[PDB]
Design a protein around this ligand. Structure first.
Ligand SMILES: CC(C)[C@H](C)[C@@H](O)[C@H](O)[C@@H](C)[C@H]1CC[C@H]2[C@@H]3COC(=O)[C@H]4C[C@H](O)[C@H](O)C[C@]4(C)[C@H]3CC[C@]12C
Ligand SMILES: Nc1ncnc2c1ncn2[C@@H]1O[C@H](COP(=O)(O)OP(=O)(O)NP(=O)(O)O)[C@@H](O)[C@H]1O
Ligand SMILES: Nc1ncnc2c1ncn2[C@@H]1O[C@H](COP(=O)(O)OP(=O)(O)NP(=O)(O)O)[C@@H](O)[C@H]1O
Ligand SMILES: [Mg+2]
Ligand SMILES: [Mg+2]
Length: 1217
């Protein structure tokens, strides 16, 4: 939206950076006007090297002068490419490093309640992560290319018009006949790719509903037809991907079909102006080639504007936080400083609301008093502003109406160094900055002594635990060297509360780690520090409040009652229901940053962003997103395997590769004709310069239609091979994802949001690893070959010195194509330890506001930024000097060859138009060789990270749904008998929810599994089918082992009903027939009238046809549950399985299960679980589990005979509505 001007991005430059942009601008101009000066000397060499063919002693003079000048020109490109790289890359680094210093100063001094996670602390941390890499990439080095390739254009039209201005308009005005046809290609390329990009999203929900509902898709046998709806939704991209291979041949055929009909136009009029006597054969070499490579080089200077519009936008967000004016600031002169405080805090009608939204009201008419030297207990039951009391004494906010006084002195007339130093804060998930266990304790006071740190951790239940660590109080909590990552989080944070020695002390509900005997150890540590200090207590559970010597209770805006724990238990005033409430019983930002960073990496480069994760429990882990270089390397034999998977089309690859060698002949067909017209321009018989220039125009036309029929073959083919490979792989991947166990889908890195991308993008980059890395080899390995055969027929004494110099002429043309992207290289990885230190400074700001840590983070950030400047000083000088020397060897070795040519002509060995036919061929050849060696690591080094998708094709499953040595199933009777059987989730095996679980089910019976307050209750049905394997023992079914049978034959006769039902993106005719294939119309209609819904399904305008999955009409959960029961009643199963869990019916006036329960159990073996104790009258048995063990069994007539057992607790929960 709002954006800065491009200027004022340089507004952080000091007095030293106005000299690294004046040196660095005279460097980029003299370098820019060097290719139009190379064309001024080379058209002055040939005018002595061939007009004097009759004077062999004038040639040796005037080529020994014009080939000394290509050493003087080599020492200008030596020191003017060293001054645009080593003076811009570093001078764009002292301005961003300075930015982060002004910025971090800005964030630390802002009112502390500005950050409330409502896309706020996921926006400030992201603004220091990416926006200081978009200000850097727009002002450092791409300005040094925008100046460079501009002054080539403004000096390619001065050397052009001075020498011969009557050709400096023919050579210029033709150029829009190339770009018009060069832009028609890139126009229709989008117009067909967008037809492929849009047609895939139809298939992007079929391979999504069959993964996000993989519990249902495995439960029925519905994976064999989940490919036939993904086969018939790629075929509308294959045949649409064919004719995009046609629009690349004719887009590269109609480019050399005008290009080879454009050199004929500017070489014909050159043959006219020489005969008429206006120019000569050397000055018409300059005025053509200066205006062409000068006029074509605005396609590079207008390529930097895409990276300039990202600078003005992302720079404005950084520049508005710095000058955002806060309210609660420190006044070091307009402030007081008391002495011998008592801590008599009194709120005198203090109202307050959240400044995010003043709609709700928190402290309407709030009035409490705090004593001196006592303990109070402000306590609520829920979010009635229970943590707002500590969030107001800190001045994290201001009260919008009211006044707060300390000992008769108000705190709004005080500075924020006398107040916050005297208050200690302990709260949930306590802040441990990634340092040792000596510097975290020194945030209370930076330098007192060593022995008081030990005395602080002595009365903290820590000193025993921090001397049983094999280092001298030196243990990294951020890095996972030694982990205190047990369930008992060892509270070292209380040592900060003890060493600081505060007068006022604001504790909080610091027992929320599933408290037990382990968290009772840190409880008594808290109970011994509240001595002689004004302190409060905030509590959630009242089991730890029973020894507190004053309790004041608020309910809504105001205090209700005061006193001690003798009258609080009395009078039943909002305490007797609350103790009945006691008896009736972050890590999201790393996903939130990964969403905002997603869907924005299409325009930005991959060496620019990050990839966020939780990592350890010390910080937010920022991976530099250049992890493709050193992670997930492909299997070594992949270049043979991908050819084997793509074989049946060996006819379509031989027919293509004979259309590839013919495309490599276009190189020397240009260079051998154009090296004959620099001969013919020096004839002296002006009618012999006409009959031998009609031959040199009918070949440019004759090789201008040749390129139409030799780019059309190489690109219509090698894409039929390239689109029967991103089809056969996309159908083998889904037939290899739907064979894994279900627990692989439970992991967060394998959700149904990334695995639908690894079939979209990562399976579509095999077209560019086996079809477009052969065609850019055989095109270039037949053009290198057919030019080193023509070079050894014409003259072999010069084409041997060029072959020895050829390892240098290809390095010099290799350095001219790394400089198009800039030599900075992975600029996210060096600035990635810096941002982690700014990552702990924002998301943990509530403890930085206390302790006065606002000047210790700034000196642990300006002490670490001295590493990414002395890395950008070494790299900017070495990679600016190894570029300025690899251009000296270019111009400094084109003046050895041409000198050596003008030496042999003196001895009569070889002649003119044999030096030129060897020198001009063997420079244009080397231009194409540094396009092949540039992709040399990408072939060998694993392809790339998106071509390394073999973790789904090459991955052995655990639970195989189909075997050969497995007996099929004839008829199940139902004989579920659980033998010694324990279980845990493979995702988190730390909890061991089943402990030698045992059951027994005879055929023709039922089961009445209790909810047991959600003790893994929906997991017994998970082991009837094989969603998981038991940790030990056998699941004895039908008197047999379950893991000795063919699994696809088993699941077709055991039908279940899922916990939270959802339907597929289809009408309601598949949804009630998805559990029964082969049935057509007859018993489908009767199948609906079981959970009846029959007027609900007949009440529809479009019959039964309604989209209920997505993008149609929306139904309710009580009505969706009606549809799901119609599945199992059509399948006619043997072992029915129902489920209820955690208030998921949502059907008031419950009648959707009065019909469905008692009419369905006619001849089946059922296992029914119910979370509510209602309609729980099972008719054959019952099962009640406690912590992985059943405790009682029988009918519902011996359960009521026991006085308590375990069911008597459940009947009291009926009255807890
Ligand atoms: C003039 C040469 C003898 C000289 C030694 C050589 O250094 C020259 O500067 C080379 C690098 C350049 C100068 C002009 C360029 C050509 C001018 O640009 C063009 O029109 C294109 C058309 C098409 O892209 C061709 O494949 C290359 C071609 C035709 C360019 C290929 C490379 C050059 C031939
Ligand atoms: N930053 C915020 N902006 C707006 N509302 C908030 C914010 N933080 C908390 N709230 C809500 O406003 C109410 C104030 O209660 P609060 O002071 O947070 O005590 P609490 O800790 O939520 N109660 P409990 O968790 O039961 O001990 C709560 O219901 C909060 O959920
Ligand atoms: N896929 C899973 N991976 C790891 N743990 C899980 C998974 N699913 C559930 N749990 C944990 O298992 C515990 C108990 O729930 P679970 O074992 O799923 O059955 P349940 O939810 O008790 N059934 P119900 O009582 O009917 O709601 C919970 O604390 C969950 O966190
Ligand atoms: Mg709280
Ligand atoms: Mg459940």
């Amino acid at each position: 939206e709002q954006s800065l001007p491009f200027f004022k991005l340089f507004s952080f430059a000091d007095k030293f950076d106005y000299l690294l942009m004046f040196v660095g601008s005279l460097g980029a101009i003299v370098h820019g006007s060097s290719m139009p000066v190379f064309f001024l000397l080379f058209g002055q060499m040939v005018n002595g090297f061939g007009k004097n063919q009759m004077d062999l002693h004038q040639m040796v003079h005037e080529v020994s002068r014009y080939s000394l000048y290509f050493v003087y020109l080599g020492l200008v490109v030596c020191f003017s490419s060293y001054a645009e790289i080593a003076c811009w890359m570093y001078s764009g680094e002292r301005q961003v490093a300075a930015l982060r210093k002004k910025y971090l100063e800005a964030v630390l001094k802002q009112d502390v309640g500005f950050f409330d996670t409502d896309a706020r602390t996921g926006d400030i941390v992201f603004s220091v992560s990416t926006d200081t890499l978009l200000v850097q990439d727009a002002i450092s080095e791409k300005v040094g290319n925008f100046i460079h390739y501009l002054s080539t254009f403004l000096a390619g039209l001065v050397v052009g018009f001075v020498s011969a201005w009557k050709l400096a308009l023919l050579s210029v005005a033709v150029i829009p006949g190339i770009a018009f046809a060069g832009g028609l290609y890139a126009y229709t390329l989008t117009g067909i790719t967008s037809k492929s990009r849009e047609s895939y999203a139809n298939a992007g929900v079929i391979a999504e509903q069959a993964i996000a509902q993989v519990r249902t898709v495995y439960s029925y046998v519905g994976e064999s037809k989940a490919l036939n709806a993904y086969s018939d939704a790629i075929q509308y991209t294959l045949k649409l991907g064919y004719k995009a291979g046609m629009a690349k041949g004719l887009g590269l055929g109609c480019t050399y079909g005008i290009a080879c009909m454009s050199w004929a136009l500017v070489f014909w009029y050159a043959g006219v102006f020489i005969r008429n006597g206006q120019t000569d054969g050397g000055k018409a070499f300059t005025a053509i080639f200066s205006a062409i490579v000068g006029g074509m080089s605005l396609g590079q200077s207008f390529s930097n504007l895409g990276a300039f519009s990202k600078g003005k936008a992302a720079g404005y967000k950084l520049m508005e936080i710095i000058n955002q004016r806060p309210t609660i600031i420190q006044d070091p002169l307009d402030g007081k400083c008391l002495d011998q405080v008592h801590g008599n805090i009194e709120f005198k009608d203090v109202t307050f609301s959240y400044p995010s939204r003043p709609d709700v009201m928190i402290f309407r008419n709030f009035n409490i008093f705090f004593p001196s030297g006592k303990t109070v207990a402000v306590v609520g039951g829920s979010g009635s502003g229970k943590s707002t009391v500590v969030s107001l004494i800190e001045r994290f906010y201001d009260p919008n109406s009211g006044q707060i006084l300390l000992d008769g002195v108000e705190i709004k007339t005080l500075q924020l160094k006398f107040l916050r130093e005297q208050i200690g804060l302990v709260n949930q998930e306590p802040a441990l900055f990634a340092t040792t266990i000596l510097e975290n304790i020194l945030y209370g006071k930076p330098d007192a002594t060593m022995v008081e740190v030990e005395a602080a951790a002595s009365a903290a239940n820590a000193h025993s635990f921090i001397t049983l660590l094999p280092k001298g109080y030196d243990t990294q909590v951020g890095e996972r060297g030694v982990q205190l990552s047990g369930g008992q989080k060892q509270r070292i944070a209380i040592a900060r509360a003890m060493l600081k020695d505060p007068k006022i002390l604001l504790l909080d509900e610091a027992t929320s780690a599933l408290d037990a005997s382990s968290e009772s150890i840190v409880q008594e540590a808290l109970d011994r520090v509240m001595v002689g200090r004004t302190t409060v207590v905030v509590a959630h559970r009242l089991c730890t409040i029973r020894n507190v010597d004053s309790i004041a209770v608020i309910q809504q805006g105001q205090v209700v009652e005061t006193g001690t724990h003798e009258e609080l238990i009395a009078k039943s005033g909002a305490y007797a229901s609350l103790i009945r409430f006691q008896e009736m019983v972050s890590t999201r930002l790393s996903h939130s940053l990964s969403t905002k960073s997603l869907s924005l990496r299409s325009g930005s480069l991959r060496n620019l962003s990050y990839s966020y994760s939780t990592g350890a429990d010390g910080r937010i882990e920022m991976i530099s997103n250049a992890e493709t270089d050193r992670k997930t390397r492909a299997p070594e034999n992949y270049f043979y395997r991908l050819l084997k998977l793509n074989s049946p089309e060996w006819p379509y690859s031989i027919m293509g590769a004979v259309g590839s060698i013919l495309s490599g002949f276009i190189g020397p067909t240009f260079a051998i004709v154009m090296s004959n017209m620099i001969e013919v321009f020096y004839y002296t018989d002006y009618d012999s310069m006409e009959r031998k220039t009609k031959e040199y125009v009918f070949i440019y036309i004759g090789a201008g239609l040749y390129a139409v029929g030799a780019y059309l073959i190489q690109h219509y083919f090698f894409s039929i091979m390239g689109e029967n490979l991103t089809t056969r792989v996309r159908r083998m991947m889904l037939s290899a994802i739907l064979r894994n166990e279900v627990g692989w889908f439970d992991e967060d890195e394998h959700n149904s949001s990334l695995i639908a991308a690894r079939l979209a993008t990562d399976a579509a980059d095999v077209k560019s690893a086996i079809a477009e890395r052969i065609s850019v080899i055989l095109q270039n390995m037949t053009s290198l070959l057919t030019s080193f055969i023509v070079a050894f027929i014409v003259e072999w004494r010069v084409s041997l010195l060029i072959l020895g110099t050829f390892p240098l002429l290809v390095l010099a043309n290799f350095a001219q194509q790394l400089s198009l992207k800039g030599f900075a290289g992975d600029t996210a990885k060096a600035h990635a330890k810096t941002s982690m230190i700014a990552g702990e400074g924002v998301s943990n700001i509530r403890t930085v506001a206390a302790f006065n840590a606002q000047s210790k983070i700034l000196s642990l950030f300006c002490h670490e930024l001295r590493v990414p400047q002395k890395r950008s000083l070494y790299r900017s000088q070495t990679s600016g000097f190894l570029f300025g020397l690899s251009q000296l060897a270019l111009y400094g070795s084109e003046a050895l060859i041409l000198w050596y040519g003008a030496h042999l002509v003196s001895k009569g060995v070889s002649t003119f138009s044999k030096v030129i036919k060897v020198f001009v061929v063997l420079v244009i050849t080397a231009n194409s060789v540094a396009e092949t060696v540039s992709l040399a690591p990408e072939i060998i080094r694993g392809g790339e990270a998106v071509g390394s998708v073999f973790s789904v094709l090459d991955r052995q499953t655990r639970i195989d749904p189909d075997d050969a040595d497995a007996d099929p199933v004839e008829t199940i009777r139902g004989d579920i008998e659980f033998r010694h059987v324990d279980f845990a989730y493979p995702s988190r095996p730390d909890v061991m929810v089943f402990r030698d679980f045992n059951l027994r089910i005879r055929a023709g019976h039922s089961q009445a599994l209790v909810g047991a307050s959600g003790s893994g209750k929906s997991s017994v049905i998970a082991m009837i089918e094989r969603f998981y394997d038991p940790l030990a023992g056998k699941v004895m079914i039908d008197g047999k082992d379950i893991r000795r049978l063919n699994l696809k034959s088993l699941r077709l006769k055991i039908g279940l009903v899922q916990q939270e039902p959802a339907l597929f993106a289809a009408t309601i005719f598949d949804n009630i027939a998805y559990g029964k294939d082969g049935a057509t119309e007859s018993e489908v209609i009767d199948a609906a009238r079981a959970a009846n819904a029959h007027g609900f399904i007949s009440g529809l305008p479009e019959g039964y046809k309604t989209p209920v999955g997505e993008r149609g009409v929306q139904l309710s959960g009580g009505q969706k549950q009606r549809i799901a029961i119609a599945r199992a009643v059509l399948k006619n199963p043997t072992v029915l399985l129902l489920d209820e869990a955690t208030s998921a019916l949502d059907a008031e006036s419950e009648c959707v299960l009065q019909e469905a329960l008692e009419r369905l159990m006619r001849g089946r073996t059922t296992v029914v679980v119910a979370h509510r104790l209602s309609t729980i009258r099972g008719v054959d048995c019952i099962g009640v589990i406690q912590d992985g063990r059943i405790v009682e069994q029988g009918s519902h007539s011996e359960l009521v005979s026991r006085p308590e057992g375990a069911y008597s607790r459940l009947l009291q929960l009926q009255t807890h509505r």
